[PDB]
């Protein structure tokens, strides 16, 4: 399979295309579905507030984009069942709208002529992949799969290394995270969630996330062993995840950092840093997660020990590099 | 006089309408609110405000009402104004703050729904349009639907009126450096047809069209067609500033311009004056529509050819709301 | 009425708010002198116009050597060395030390050498009496001359830790505060002392930041000495901050039980508030508490007999902390 | 002359070095003077909040940086007259501290053994160069020259084009500009300038600038014909300049836009756009100024006409590209 439709050409949907070109995937996006015109999609693709100008030529006609000299159809169907995927023969849908995050909802893509769906968010109790953690669980019979959230892709590799080296008995996560499209520009209704209604660039806003709660889908041994949440803050992209764990062994900071370093060695998904970086330094990361040995903290009172480990993530472009790794393998099975 | 008000669109402007009415102990009673959400969520937004802080009065709710300072306010959720049941609590004057009924044709739906008069919190085409303390004497008993134009009009008009009256404005162009609002985007993505409006508002200087100068003739007839302008939307949450560059009808000094302005702001509850070195956060919470800033006045001249730059601040939320309320109170007593 | 005469050293974010709060509560303390590094004109400007709290609620004027605030004169000095401040000229006895440059008993001694009698330091100042009001203020006595009120973070952390310790025991814990940026940080990337991360553009980054709030908690709650660690993530909000604590407690608990204990500890407690509303950081701006526990963020994670308890409290690290500083000051002045 | 020293390794000073490497200049930076350690300078060079990771290797020693393999001496002399520029033979000093903005002040570098100084700011009535407006005025005997401000580099090529095509009779400028290190993070004393004392990322802050007032140093025919100021706003970099003029001829918008387009043709310093860009789209620009045809406004009543023209500028990297063009020419005289 090498024909891709993008449903939802948003922050994630546009960067998917950017990253496919940057890595020279043999995948071809043949169709984009969204809610707008080729003119406006072209403008958005050409000019990006977080990553700067598109590195390839971009033009449009009434019905397509022309990206690096190649044509991509543009549709504007708000219900997925009506999307004409058959027209250009889109095989794998990268479902990036947020409105089809369940196998039953995303079935609509298959009913409409697609063969597979890769959902760019948590999508309940379905197969959910963090690349370089559990991508060996994918087979040729999977049709609709999830790559969870950016926060999952941050948390999972760090949890996996800790669990493998020391065991995690129980833990809780807080991610201090860049604001996203699901939040509000000015104070006003945003569905049912009271905190999501508040001005995002003017507030620290507590925010629910299932990344720890559903980690069992990616690291079966940790099912039910973690909880967590987010604090959304006023940065445009670039985020950090802290995990406080009770481990299966007594450890030093140095031991923990070394075990992590080893986990990140020749691991294109998971990086390491012992530099004094800040969030803007992760913008444009090609990792899903970058463990930061400078923030490791072991609090020990006799037999009791709390371990705080911290990893950075570009919740836009970093997460996208993982989505694309999963896509490229999904495409071959 | 009319005393019962309905608010359509309990948004940034709608909520501050209620706050200001209670603040000035108005005899006007808000008896109903129409929006698209639950009392619960409206109560949460009313209690907790990112720009102005905690609501200064008690807030509770029921399944179909808010209870504000102990007084019950009906809450409806009709997306079409014609369907709002304004007669249930006898709402007489609707303060129309949704942005979706900005014409006479559109807003007369509230009259079909049982109201008596409508005051629109935005420009609404060529209808009677009032900047209080500029042209509020043009209101009369036969006006049924009226506009108070934009925050930018309320900032620009008193400054332009004073310049027009003292010196003449032959021609001018405005630029307002303005706080971002709800019509903009949190992250880069579609926002109707306007390409700039699609960009992340708190991360960019964004050029932005406004009719404030173009439609100024509704408020100052002598300046009809004599002004143009635009906005640069920037990352501040509220508090904005408007610059006007004019060819005036007289050779002037900065001191003469500033004195003329100071005079126009004397005994004027709508239009303030400052010669302090203020910045935008100092205007948040202002009870004026516009505050002229003498420290920014600039006269550029080569021979007879003279450009005059005058600058006024405005709290595009609360300050504008104070103008809306002054107009509302007068409108209720005609 | 005790009419102690106060001097403020460092008329900065905290120093200016100290005056605001004293006037707001109609304190019997008289502020008679201020020392900074600048002119009365500039201090008058900054006092009148505040980016976080708006217009000063009283009149402000200046002369060549004073501020006039609501009609009352306050002498202005500009002595970069505290020993040279003429605190005796207007009789300033209690100095509120808000510069960041005298954060020890030995450094703040200079105010006593200059003729003051007591110093209250608006920051951690090592192993000296360190007070969080309504946690350990009953340790002050008539013999104290130099005392600390620790950091805003300590004032947020301590009341929540004290309630938890008193109700359930805390065996061990780690804190992270997601916190507004302050004057120690940088506007644009550039050198800022030795702290590399402090060099980075504060309104454009999430910046990890060290704080002693957890590590030194034993000054305030002696039973918890050595049992807590923690750090901050500084973020682009101008004021208003939140502190999370993850604890192993001495007994198994439910979220309700933790929230009820905290509720009880906040009852009739002018220093420590409670909320169960879904507030965000701007809702804490101008708080008159040092800390507001947020029951909505309580989380119990348990596997077998292993339990992690996460408890969360807001704080306005400027005005909120200042209200604690003032309560301490008022008591410290009556002894 | 090919050996350079940088005084002030700040936003401008570090980007000077970045741009010299980027263009593979033959200029050799042999020394840097600042107030801090090599360790801290290395960290700042490597990690940049506006422009991301340094594209070359960076290490340090107790008295040096090692950048792309090459040693650069680091001094910490707060008085320029004490900088030991003769040790590594620095001939031309790029003066980027802001503390030596006059001939009399920057003479110190020549006393310290340098031969020439290029000041990264306005510096009074001395030779002042906006590259591709008046760089022809640089002379073999000049030893101290200025490149004015970022705002001047934005305004001048627009003013030159208008003046050449139509005449500017009189004009006034407002730049809506990114905040800079002369401002304050929190409200507090900032020398004598009261507006500069205010929290820069939380305010619109009027700010005086000489860009227009001193335009006659760059375009002598416009001496005394312009005034202007800035409004500093909460964006980290990327700015815009509006100019309102009385021109010597009646014009259409198309005519103004066409004249500006011609002036930008084969002009490495002056770009054009008719795209609906916003400030983030200018970040990383290699122009001193980019005229934006989309904002052109002609306001006419009878025989009176006001003409508003608008150009974008990256007040950091864009201006630095102009500084380096000027330095390259200067070094060969
Ligand atoms: N932004 C992040 O940090 C991030 C990271 C990882 C995963 N995700 C996930 O990826 C998905 C997309 O997030 P995003 O931040 O790009 O959101 P976004 O809001 O930027 O983009 C959504 C896009 O989908 C379009 N859209 C909405 N409804 C549609 C419909 N019915 N049909 C077609 N197009 C539709 C919108 O026009 C928009 O272009 C979400 O499920 C989100 O949870 C986001
Ligand atoms: N924010 C400002 O600076 C400002 C200043 C002056 C005037 N205005 C004008 O006031 C109006 C409101 O602006 P705002 O900033 O308060 O916008 P907002 O988006 O904050 O509020 C709009 C409110 O109306 C509600 N709504 C939308 N469609 C509706 C419908 N069909 N029926 C009932 N309720 C509906 C929304 O739920 C929201 O609560 C606009 O016309 C705007 O131009 C805004
Ligand atoms: N969030 C907060 O801002 C906060 C909260 C609690 C405690 N504190 C503490 O309070 C103190 C002040 O913090 P701030 O935020 O008000 O800092 P600030 O930088 O806003 O204020 C410092 C003031 O001290 C003056 N100053 C510096 N050196 C001086 C000297 N040698 N003599 C006289 N004046 C001098 C400065 O000019 C400035 O006005 C620090 O110790 C800080 O840790 C700050
Ligand atoms: N940032 C901009 O947008 C911009 C654009 C054009 C020109 N400039 C100008 O360039 C100059 C530098 O601006 P910047 O934004 O890089 O400022 P900055 O504050 O970022 O850098 C100044 C550097 O000089 C150092 N320094 C200060 N005093 C010193 C001394 N006495 N000796 C040696 N080093 C010293 C500082 O430690 C810092 O590294 C100024 O003249 C400024 O007007 C700035
Ligand atoms: O509420 C759902 C998400 O947690 C919000 O943002 P996101 O979907 O872009 O990650
Ligand atoms: O709690 C935080 C401190 O009081 C922060 O202080 P600071 O102003 O010294 O950064
Ligand atoms: O424009 C006047 C000041 O010099 C401020 O900023 P800048 O010097 O970095 O341009």
Author numbering:
A (entry chain R), D (entry chain P): 1 to 333
B (entry chain O): 0 to 333
C (entry chain Q): -1 to 333
From the manuscript:
Two novel G3P-binding forms were observed in the ternary complexes WT.NAD.G3P and C150A+H177A.NAD.G3P. In these structures, the C3 phosphates of G3P are all located in the “Ps” site, while the “new Pi” site remains unoccupied. First, in the P subunit of C150A+H177A.NAD.G3P, the oxygen atom O1P of the C3 phosphate forms hydrogen bonds with the Oγ atoms of Thr182 and Thr180, as well as with NH1 of Arg232. However, it is the O3P oxygen atom that forms hydrogen bonds with the same amino acid in the Q subunit. The second difference is the orientation of O1 and O2 in G3P. In the P subunit, O1 of G3P forms hydrogen bonds with Nε of His207, and one water molecule, while O2 of G3P forms hydrogen bonds with water. However, in the Q subunit, the O1 of G3P forms hydrogen bonds with Oγ and the amide nitrogen of Thr151, while the O2 of G3P interacts with the amide nitrogen of Ala150. The G3P of the O subunit of C150A+H177A.NAD.G3P is present in hydrate form. We compared the G3P-binding form in the wild type and mutants, and found that after mutation, the catalytic cavity is increased almost 10 Å3 in C150A+H177A.This is helpful for G3P to move.
Glyceraldehyde-3-phosphate dehydrogenase (GAPDH) is a highly conserved enzyme involved in the ubiquitous process of glycolysis and presents a loop (residues 208–215 of Escherichia coli GAPDH) in two alternative conformations (I and II). In the presence of inorganic phosphate (Pi), GAPDH catalyzes the conversion of D-glyceraldehyde-3-phosphate (G3P) to 1,3-diphosphoglycerate (BPG), accompanying the reduction of NAD+ to NADH. All the structures reported in this paper have four subunits: O, P, Q, and R. Each subunit contained two domains: the C-terminal catalytic domain and the N-terminal NAD+-binding domain. Two anion recognition sites, “Ps” and “Pi”, bind the C3 phosphate of G3P and inorganic phosphate, respectively.
